[PDB]
Each structure stands twice: as structure tokens, then as C-alpha cells.
Symmetry: none
Subunit: 296 residues, 4 copies
Amino acid sequence: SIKIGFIGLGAMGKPMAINLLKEGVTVYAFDLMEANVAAVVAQGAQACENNQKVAAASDIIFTSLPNAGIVETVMNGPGGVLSACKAGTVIVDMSSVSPSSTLKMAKVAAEKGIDYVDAPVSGGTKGAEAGTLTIMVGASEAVFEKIQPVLSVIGKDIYHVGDTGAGDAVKIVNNLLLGCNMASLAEALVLGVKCGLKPETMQEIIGKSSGRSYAMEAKMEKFIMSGDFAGGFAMDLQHKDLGLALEAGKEGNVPLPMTAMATQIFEGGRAMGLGREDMSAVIKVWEQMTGVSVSG
Amino acid sequence: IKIGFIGLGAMGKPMAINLLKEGVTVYAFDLMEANVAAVVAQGAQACENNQKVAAASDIIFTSLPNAGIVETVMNGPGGVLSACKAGTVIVDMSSVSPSSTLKMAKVAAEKGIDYVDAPVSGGTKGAEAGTLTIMVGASEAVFEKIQPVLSVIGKDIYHVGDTGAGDAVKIVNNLLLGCNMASLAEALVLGVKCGLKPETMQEIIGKSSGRSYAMEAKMEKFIMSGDFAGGFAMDLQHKDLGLALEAGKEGNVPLPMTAMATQIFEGGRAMGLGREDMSAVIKVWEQMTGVSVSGG
Amino acid sequence: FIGLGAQKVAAASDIIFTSLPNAGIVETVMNTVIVDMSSVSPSSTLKMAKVAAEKGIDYVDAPVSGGTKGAEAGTLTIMVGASEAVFEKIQPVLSVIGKDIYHVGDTGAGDAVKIVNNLLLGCNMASLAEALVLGVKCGLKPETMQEIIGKSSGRSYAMEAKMEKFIMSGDFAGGFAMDLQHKDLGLALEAGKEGNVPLPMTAMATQIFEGGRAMGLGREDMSAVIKVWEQMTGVSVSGG
Amino acid sequence: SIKIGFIGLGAMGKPMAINLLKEGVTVYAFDLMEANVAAVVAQGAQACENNQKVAAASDIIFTSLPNAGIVETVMNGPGGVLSACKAGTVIVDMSSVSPSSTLKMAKVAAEKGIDYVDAPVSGGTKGAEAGTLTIMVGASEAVFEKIQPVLSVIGKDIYHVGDTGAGDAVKIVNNLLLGCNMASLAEALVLGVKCGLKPETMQEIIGKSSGRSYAMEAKMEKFIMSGDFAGGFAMDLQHKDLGLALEAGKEGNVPLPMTAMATQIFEGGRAMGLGREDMSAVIKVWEQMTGVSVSGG
């Protein structure tokens, strides 16, 4: 009986909608690309002419937009999603944005009797397809219990991480650490090579020692030692993530010196045209400056 | 077999005892009385000075504070090197640059003395249990010669490369430990400010791409408990970061993340936290912001 | 004058002055010559100039320095991004309210130069803060440092302006608010990101000033950022 | 008949000795390089066989050595200068070293009745020749008054900056700021150019604005805009100075984040082979990384 809406049907939105449809959940949908609407309508989705129509028909609405500015335009802007929602509707914003962004939307939403929830996800498109996404939720207890059953169809590990802004927050904190750990690894590996260590032995030893991190596990063999930096996690995206951390630090008055430094190092890689390569490509900032070769 | 100990610190003492427990002959001298007496009770043969330990021993262990003191002890007037019989191996566990050890192996070699860097990790508890991780820079021939003795005092014995490369790999590992911790410190304070429980961050980040051994070693035992007694002293982690920066300067390798981590740990030392576990560096940000992480 | 800080007006005026808090408020308020003195990125101004140009309106960035005292005395330094023709047009009016009127380049270069200047002010101050604490810890009186460094190669306007009046007095009221200096450093980082120019010194200065803000020092003069190191180390400079 | 000694006669030592000789003060001297001793002996210096010889004959001894390690070797090492000094002798160490380096040495000197003072100088070789050096002295009041008249021949502005280690300290603090200000300038200028500013526009405007520094005044036109980074103040030396600051920060438990970052940026320049160029050549780090052209030539 509960009605689900999708404002946009991207790489994530589409498989999520399909998984909901396979549980016989009523799903309304609009996307600017017609073919995306048609893809889900074939699995039983009900197409809508625009965002407002999805809003008016739905109880729980999913969205994932590129930034806070677009969220505000879509939600609060002229003829916005918020104005077209019935009271008691829940908006589930999976956009990669700062907690403060979500807090300010939740405020405007609350006045209209609309519940606004940050629920960023991890697992990618493959996790989206399999319905195994990790979903980190910032909400009241009452609202989390409201939406949890629907979340449990599209994801596997559903975390109630705190109140509003907490989903966005935990993602930002995780990705900040990934970026910092990688930036630290980049210069460390160059130093080790300069001091006569083969990357193989640094991998073997540090991998079993206290210096180890997921950053190193994920990147050293596949990207750094291969020298193939195609694919993976784009340096531009990692940089964007570090910027979101810095935005959160500014808004919360929390100094972030390591994050700040990592951000500028990755900016160096971008300056060198490496933005679309996996983020571990940032090691090339140091290789080129020193003539030390790690990525053999 | 004749083992010698130039100095008998927190590490030297238990190492000598473990060797004595295997019935190996151990000669020893220390700066103070009581340390020699401690091991002589376990079967050690006391010596009047360094020069006397050197003459009697086949394998000599030392761990000195810096390269300058190594220089003075080894090569200085009436030094250890001059008193060693050819074919003697010196095992230097001092936290020093590879070049320091290179410089010293070169003078040793002309005397027919083998000089190997063998820094250790595991602390005094690992020293007592004989479970130290030992990272060795040496020739293959020299490693096989000392390995059986190393195997009594340590568990994981690594032949990491030739002379100094042992210093190098320890420096690279501990640099990463320090950077990963410094990054974690600010990240956790940000997360709490954005309304996350430390527990929550531990769960999620521990299972995601931000994770590191730093977090897994320190979070629950020290940070969440708020008990920063023991562990790995902030002074020692700072020293290690300094050795990295020395190596970076000597090799012309920029180390911006390391450099920033060093100054953050200096802040902790400025606050009187040098004797606490290195994770107490989080108090830098706690004091400045008023954000409390270190509670349960 | 849209606003009078420290379309009724639009329809009547030939030259309109405004200074708004950020680019978001500019594009709300905006979207004849418009002289935008707002503290914004060059790109922000470039977008507003393009929409303005479409309906025959000239849009210039003319950020100023000199503060309220310079505003009162009519001695403001004004940095202008515009065409030659448009600068020629507005210059006589600019010359009443300011002294040194610079035609720094075309649209936005005016934003650029103020951002680059204020970045350096912030970095120079952040560097000064830790330097002074080091000196005192090593047994130097602030007075001795002011004398020697003021005459040698370490000197900067930052030191010249802040050292005696704020730091040594300990009176951090007034001056140039730490929040505003931090805002300026942020604009530099925004420009660095947009232009793919690494700004490591700026980035660290920004975080050091954020520490001051975390300590509640945001409305004090920016040289108050020295308190970050004073509180952390126990070292006192800000007497004498 | 005060007796002055020189342990080494470099670019600074030589003209200092000559200025002292022109006041008719007795000057003893030794240097590894023989021609340096001959240069001053022609102006009336008395040559010595070695450092100890100079030490035994002199009341006030000048030295300027490359680092704290060499200071210890020369002063305290086997057959050192300290062992050969008579009690009441004053050592004036102009070496570029940390305050702690000097404090250690002063303590070993003090037990032998020898006064040890840090007196680093500024003004360069031209100031050394003209006798117009600025001299920053860390010492007791009694010891400063003792040596001040001799200092006043070789220098013009003689500062009693504090007790032992304060001369070293003030120099370190000044040069730290120079290095930081330059590092900040480097990235700032690249940003400005990328945003469409000419270097001339920035020099003109920032030079008359709150962003200005001596770093910018000294380097912008002569080195950066010319693109000629020959001469000036070597990047290696500025880097060394920033290292001394970090050493003092560690010893005093004073965090130095801006200094630390400046140090690593200048290390980048050294990594690119720029160590012998003027330190403003550090801007080439960002030019190479970005493709942005600021420096001329």
C-alpha cells in the first residue's frame, strides 16, 4: 500500500526502483531521460510527467542529486518538490552533501510537515542491483522505523547512525580518511623507493604491520605497482569528498589540517591532468617532482 | 655461542633473559648497576665496559638514541668496532636513518666486522614474550648467520633487504602509523561534532574504506576508554616522524602529510601528553573545540 | 546604493553600488553600470556580467580596501575589473569615494587581485603567530623581535599592522575580524580549486584560523589567532 | 692589548679579522685553507698551526661553523678548542645553529670557566667588509659588556637580544618568516596569473597593500619577473634555516605548521634540482606542476 517515488533514475536509482517493484511495492518515477523511465515502467513502475507529480503521489521519495545547490533548487526552488508533498511524506536524500545542507532542508521540510532524511549509500551500482547497499541514515527514531522496511529491500546493512545529517556525516568522515591515508601512502612509498626499497617488500611488510590501511590494500598492487590507473575511484571524486569534509569542518568549527593538506596534494594531481584516473595516481605528483619511480 | 649487549634498556633486558633461557652465553654492560645485576641473576656474564663485551662476543646487540651516539659508541675513541674480533656481527636496533647505518657498516667492513640494522617493533611486552617483529637489513649470508639468535628474541623476523633498507622500511611503516592516527584524530572530532557516536564511527568506518590499523588498535582501547596510559608513547611516534623527515631531506623527497602529522603531535607534546599513548593526540582537537570524543 | 552598511533604486540610477555577503545573495539580489564590491570569486562576477550584458547593463567588480575609516575619509583603495570604456566612465565617481583607484584588468581580475592580496595577509599572519611564540619560548621579548625582524628580511605588513597595536597590547578588539580573514582564505581556496592551482600554505593558514574560530575568537582581530598557540603551549606573548 | 682569535677565516671571518687589525687589535688565526691565513697575515695577523694554538693565545675567539655537529667536534671533540682555552676566555659562536646547540656547549664551556656566546650576524660579506654587520648576541650582561667593544669594530648594530641562545633564536625566527612569506608568495602569484593577472599588476597592487612583505619586495622584480634565479639567497640555505626553526620548535615544544609546510615546499624545489638557485625559484615547483607561467626569461 505504501507509495515510493523516485526524483531521478540514475545508475543507482534504477536498480533500486526495480528491486522495490520485485517486492510488489508501488513505485512512481520521473527522470529527464525518458529511456530510464521506460526501463522501470517495463518492470511495473508508474511514470510521471515531472518531479511535482511524483511528489504528490508518493509517501517515501528517493533522490540523489549532484550537490547542495541542486538539492535546494529541486526541493525548495520555484514549484519545488517540497511544495508538492503531502504532509507526513518522507524525503530520502542520498545526495553526497554536507550535514548542514541536509539540516537546512530538513528545517524547511519540517514546516510543511515533511520528514527529510539523509541516507547516503555505499556499494555502488553492483550493490544497487543486488540490493546489498550499505545505507547510513540520519533521522529521528520514529522516522527511521517508518522507512527501515523499504530501505531493507534496496539495501543489506541499514544503519541508523544518528539524527539528521549523520548519514552524510559518516560517509564524509570515512572518505576523508580514505583520501588522507592515500595521500600519506603516496609520499611514503616514494621515500621507501628512494631509500632502496622495492614496492613488493613495502607491500609485504607494511601490509602485515601497523602502517597498514585499506587505502594501501586496495591500491598498491592493482594500481600503483601495475602502473595502470584507469578506473577505480576517480581522483576528482576523492577530491570532491575531501572538499565536503572541509565544508563540514568550517560549518562545525573543527580544524582539519591533515584533510586540508591531502586536498591540496590531490589538487596537484588534478593540475597534472590526472583527475579521471584512480586517486592513487596522486603518487605521480611525487614521482615527477623527484624522478623516483614507484609505479613500475 | 657468544651474545653481547651494549646497553640493557627496557628492550635489552628481556631480550638477554630470553637468550639466557635458551642456554646461550650472554655478556653484558649497562650505564647503570642494577640492569647488569638483573640479567646476571638469570645467568649473564657482566663486563666492565663496552670494549670488554665487544671482545668476548660474536653477535652484539645495541639500541642507542641517535646516529651521533651510535657514531661515538661504535667508532669514537676506544670504540666498540676497534675491540671486535673480525667476523663479529653487530646488530644495531637504534632508530636511525639508513645512511647512518650505511656510513657505519662501511667502517665496520674494513675491520672485517658485519654491521646490520635490525630495528624491532612490539614494545617491551613483545620483548618479554619474545614475540618482537624484527626487520633486518643485511647480506643473505649475514642474515642466515644471525637468524637463529633473532628467532629466540623475536617472532616475525623479516629479511627486508640489504644494509639500511631495514631502517628504511621501519621508518616508512611508522610514518604511516603516525599519519593515519593524526588523520583519525581530526576525523573523529568532526564526526562527533556532526552528531555521530564514536561507537557508530567505529562500526561503520571499521567495515569501510577509511579503516586503518591505527584506528583498529587505538579506537576502542584508548580513545573510547579515555585511558591513554601505556601503548606507544606520543614522544616515540613523534621521534619516528622526525626520522622520516630526516630521510626525506636526505633523499630530496617531499613529505607534506608527514610534516603536518609531526606538528600535530608536537601540539600534543606541548600539552604535556608525550608519555601517553600517541592516540591522546586527539586531545589537541578536543581541548581547542570543546568536543568530547574520548568518552565511551 | 543597494544597501548602506558600514528596483526602486535600480530604475532611477546610472551607477549602482552594492556589497553583499556572498555569491548566492548577489544572484538572488541581481538575477546602467553595476559596481559590485562584494567579496566573491571572479567566476561569480563573470556569470553576473554575462546576464547583465544581455540586457545592456555593465557589471564591474570593484572590491575595496581601507575599512570604514578609509570609507569615511574617502581614501579607499579600489580594485576594478572592467573594460577600458567602462572604467573611464565610472572612474570620476570612484575617485570621490576612494583614493587609489586601480584598473587591475577586465571583469573579475579585480576579484582575483583582492583574493591574492588577502591570502598573503592571512598566510603572513599565520606564520607570524607561530614564529612569535617560538621566539618567546626561546627567551626573546616581543619588543626585541619587533625591533630586529621589523628591520630585517622576515618583515611583512601583517607584522607591521598587528604586532604593536593588537598582539603586544593584548587588545584584539576591532581591526580586521578573524571571521572575515578566514572567509577570504576560503575564497582563495575556491579560486585554487576552480583554477587547479595547489595552495598548501593558504590551506594550512585556513585551518589555523579555523582553530581560532573554534576557540570563539571569530569577531576579534585576525592576529588573535596567536591565542591558538598560546593556549596550547602555555607561552604568553600578548603582554608588553 | 685584547687578543682576538679566529677558528676559520671564511668569507665573513677574513674581513672581520682585517677590520680588527686596522684598529691595531692583536689577531691570531688558523684555517684549513692556507691562502686565507696569508691574506690576513699580510694585514698584521699572527698565523697559528691549528685551532688549539689559536685557543691558547686568545681572549676572544670567533668561529662560524656549518652545523651543531661540527661545533661539538671542533669545541668539545678530542683535543678540542675548549680544552685549550684559558679560563675567562670568551667564545663567540656565529654558527647557524639552534639555541639548544649553543646552550649545551655553554654548559660544557662554563665548567672550564669559559664563556660561550651565540652571536649570529646579518649583512653578508659586504657588511663584513664595511664593518656594518648586525650582530645579535645571547649572553649574560657582564659578558656582553666584555665583548661589546670588539663587536663594535666588526659590526654596526650590536644587539644584546637576551641570554645564551637568544641571538641564534632571533635569527632563526627572522629567517623562518622570510621562508614562509616566500612559500606563500609562490603559490599566490601562480593563482593570480591563472586568474588572469599580470605579475606587474600584482607587484604594483600587492606591493602597496596589506599582502606585502620584504620577501615580495626583494624577490619579485629581481628574480621572479626576470626569470634569472642566479645568485641571491640559495634555496638550500633557506631550507636549512627552516630546518633549524623546526629543530627549535621540537626542542621547545612549539608547533610550527606553516614553517613545516614551507620546508616541504622548498624540499620540492630541491628535488627539482633548484637548490643552488635563489630561493624564490621555489615558484618553479608550481609552474612545472600547473603549466602556469609567472617567472620571466
